[PDB]
Design a protein around this ligand. Structure first.
Ligand code: C6L
Ligand code: ZN
Ligand code: ZN
Length: 294
C-alpha cells in the first residue's frame, strides 16, 4: 500500500525529480468531461486498453534542484488526502530530500490537490524554510469566491462541495500568508523560471517554464486531465474547470504552442511520470508520452 515514488531526470545542468502524491480514482465518467459524450469517452478508453468504468488521474509533482535553490511545484492533497493520496513527503524522502530542504514552493493554483500539502493538521507549515508563490489573481479569486463565480462551471451543480472546499482553501491561504509571494510575470526568477497565466481551470492557473541553457520544460499543471480523452477532444472540458470556455481556450492555446514548438511538457494528472510531447491532430491533439529505460 505504498504509492510513493520518484523519477530523476536532467534538464541541462539541472537535476529534476518527478514525485507522486498518489492518485485520484474517478468513477463518474458522465461528469468527468461536462461537454463530452460518455458513450464515445468509454469507447476511447476501451480502444486504448484502459478500464472503461473509471479514469485514474495521477498526482505528479516536480522538484527542481538548482545551484542555489530547491523548488517544489505543487504539494499534493496534504490535509485533504484520502487513502490514495498524501504520499508527497514519502516520495520526497525516496528522492533523497526532506521538507526542510525545500526553499520555495510554486503553486500552480489553489485547488485541494495542489495546495493541500503546504500545511499540516496543526495548521503549521510543512516546509518551514520555503517561500510559497501563487499568482495574485488566483489568491484574490479564492479570497472573494462565491457561488456566482461558478456559473460557467460544472461545479455549480454541487454547492455541497463548494461550501466545504472554498472555506478550507481560504483558511490555507490565511495560514501561509507569512511565506506568501506573488509571481512576477515579467521577470525570470532564480535564473531558471518563467511564469505565465493560463486562466480557466481557475482564474489564475499558472504555467511554469523551467529553462537551463537551451533546454526547456513547461509545467502545464491542470491544463489537461486525460491523455486519451482531452487531447483529441479539448473542448469536452473537465469537471473541475472554474470556467469551461476559458479553460478550453487556454488548453488549445498551450497545447498548440507545445505542438508548434515541439516542446516537452510536464503534467499534474496524466499517467506517470507525466512527461511528454504534443502533436496536432486536427481539430485536436495527441499526447506522445516520453519513453524511459527505468
Ligand atoms: C472548489 C474547487 C473544487 C474542484 C477541485 C478539483 O477539480 N480537483 C481536481 C479534480 C479532482 O476531482 C483537479 O482539478 O484536478
Ligand atoms: Zn485543479
Ligand atoms: Zn489538479
Amino acid at each position: 500500500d505504498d504509492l510513493s515514488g520518484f523519477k530523476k531526470i536532467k534538464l541541462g545542468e539541472l537535476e529534476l525529480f518527478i514525485l507522486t502524491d498518489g492518485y485520484i480514482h474517478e468513477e463518474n465518467l458522465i461528469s468527468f468531461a461536462p461537454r463530452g459524450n460518455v458513450a464515445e469517452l468509454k469507447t476511447i478508453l476501451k480502444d486504448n486498453f484502459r478500464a472503461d468504468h473509471y479514469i485514474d488521474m495521477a498526482i505528479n509533482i516536480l522538484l527542481v534542484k538548482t545551484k542555489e535553490k530547491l523548488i517544489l511545484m505543487d504539494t499534493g492533497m496534504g490535509i485533504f488526502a484520502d487513502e490514495r493520496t498524501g504520499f508527497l513527503l514519502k516520495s520526497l524522502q525516496k528522492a533523497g530530500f526532506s521538507a526542510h530542504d525545500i526553499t520555495d514552493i510554486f503553486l500552480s493554483h489553489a485547488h485541494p490537490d495542489h495546495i493541500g500539502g503546504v500545511v499540516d493538521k496543526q495548521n503549521k507549515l510543512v516546509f518551514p524554510n520555503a517561500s510559497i508563490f501563487i499568482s495574485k489573481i488566483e489568491h484574490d479569486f479564492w479570497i472573494n469566491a462565491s457561488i456566482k463565480d461558478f456559473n460557467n462551471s460544472a461545479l455549480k451543480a454541487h454547492p455541497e462541495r463548494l461550501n466545504q472546499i472554498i472555506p478550507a482553501l481560504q483558511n490555507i491561504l490565511k495560514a501561509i500568508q507569512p511565506k506568501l509571494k506573488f509571481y512576477d510575470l515579467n521577470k525570470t526568477l532564480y535564473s531558471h523560471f518563467n511564469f505565465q497565466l493560463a486562466p480557466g481551470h481557475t482564474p489564475g492557473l499558472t504555467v511554469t517554464t523551467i529553462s537551463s541553457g537551451n533546454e526547456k520544460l513547461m509545467y502545464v499543471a491542470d491544463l489537461i486531465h486525460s491523455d486519451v480523452i482531452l487531447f483529441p477532444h479539448p473542448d469536452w472540458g473537465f469537471s473541475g474547470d472554474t470556467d469551461l470556455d476559458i479553460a478550453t481556450a487556454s488548453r488549445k492555446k498551450f497545447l498548440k504552442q507545445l505542438a508548434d514548438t515541439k516542446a516537452r511538457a510536464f503534467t499534474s494528472h496524466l499517467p506517470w511520470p507525466g512527461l511528454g510531447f504534443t502533436k496536432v491532430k486536427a481539430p485536436g491533439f495527441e499526447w506522445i508520452p516520453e519513453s524511459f529505460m527505468n
